[PDB]
């Protein structure tokens, strides 16, 4: 346990609960108490490598892993501490945020997510509550690598191949995330928020378009995918996103391509015209 004390728990997060503390020297970090399902199993030492290269993620969009504390089935993790998740934020923003705000956000997401990308590290469970927000309005990404090392459980980021059971490593899944994340930050609401599998796809493909051979070829050979889905034309874009102008618009089309194979980049949309204005 390092010496840490004044042990404040702020949550449960993803892989376990969070606590802000401080040292023996006072200084404010966020601990992650990772919760083990078997209690007995242990942690392997692949495992304990896989989260410890994450160290080596140095970005000033990447929260910092200071530290890996593992001491009889008891395993901690010791972050940086941001006051706030994107998610509390948009709680309290009625209608969303101002499009100045959802511009700085984005392209600190994908900076991040760039960073990452180039290291072939992936993150696949983005989503609001692991975009952390300090008081200077820098926005840090949490949870990156993570579940490399570990693999009730919120879908609306997932992107449709995922859903229909593809495994493969891929860079497209985190783009997916940010196009969702994207319209939520200037909606205010969640973009696709599906109650199972089978309903966030039809959320997907209500307003995206039912997929098929033609606009994604190679879709049939999805595990999940099902000839029977029901046929959706596409909606205009501009009849479901509000505040964003027409270059924002023509980013967000372009990170919620259906086929990952036709997706935009991190590094690609850090270059879109939405972002020179
Ligand atoms: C749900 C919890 C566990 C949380 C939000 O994602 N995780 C969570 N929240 C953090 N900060 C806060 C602090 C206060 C609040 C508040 O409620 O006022 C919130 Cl949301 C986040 C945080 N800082 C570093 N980390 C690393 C551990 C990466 C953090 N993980």
């Known amino acids: 346990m390092e010496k840490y004390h004044g042990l404040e728990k702020i949550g449960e997060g993803t892989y376990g609960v969070v606590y802000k503390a401080q040292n023996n020297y006072g200084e404010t970090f966020a601990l992650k108490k990772i919760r083990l399902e078997k209690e007995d199993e242990g942690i392997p030492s692949t495992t304990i490598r896989e989260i410890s290269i994450l160290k080596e993620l140095k970005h000033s969009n990447i929260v910092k892993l200071y530290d890996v504390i593992h001491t009889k089935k008891r395993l901690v993790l010791v972050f940086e501490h941001l006051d706030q998740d994107l998610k509390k934020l948009l709680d309290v923003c009625e209608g969303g945020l101002e499009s100045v705000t959802a511009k700085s956000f984005l392209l600190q997401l994908l900076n991040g997510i760039a960073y990452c990308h180039d290291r072939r590290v992936l993150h696949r469970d983005l989503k609001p509550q692991n975009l952390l927000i300090n008081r200077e309005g820098e926005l840090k ?137």
């Open 141 to 277: 990404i949490a949870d990156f690598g993570l579940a490399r090392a570990f693999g009730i459980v919120t879908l609306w980021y997932r992107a449709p191949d995922v859903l229909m059971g593809s495994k493969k490593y891929s860079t497209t899944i985190d783009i997916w995330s940010v196009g969702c994340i994207f319209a939520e930050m200037v909606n205010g609401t969640p973009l696709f928020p599906g109650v199972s599998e089978a309903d966030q796809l039809m959320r997907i493909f209500r307003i995206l378009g039912t997929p098929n051979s033609k606009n994604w070829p190679n879709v049939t050979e999805l595990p999940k995918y099902d000839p029977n889905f029901t046929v959706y034309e596409p909606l205009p874009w501009e009849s479901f996103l509000k505040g964003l102008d027409e270059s924002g618009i023509d980013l967000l089309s372009k990170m919620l391509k259906l086929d990952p194979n036709q997706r935009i980049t991190a590094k690609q949309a850090l270059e879109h015209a939405y972002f020179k204005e």
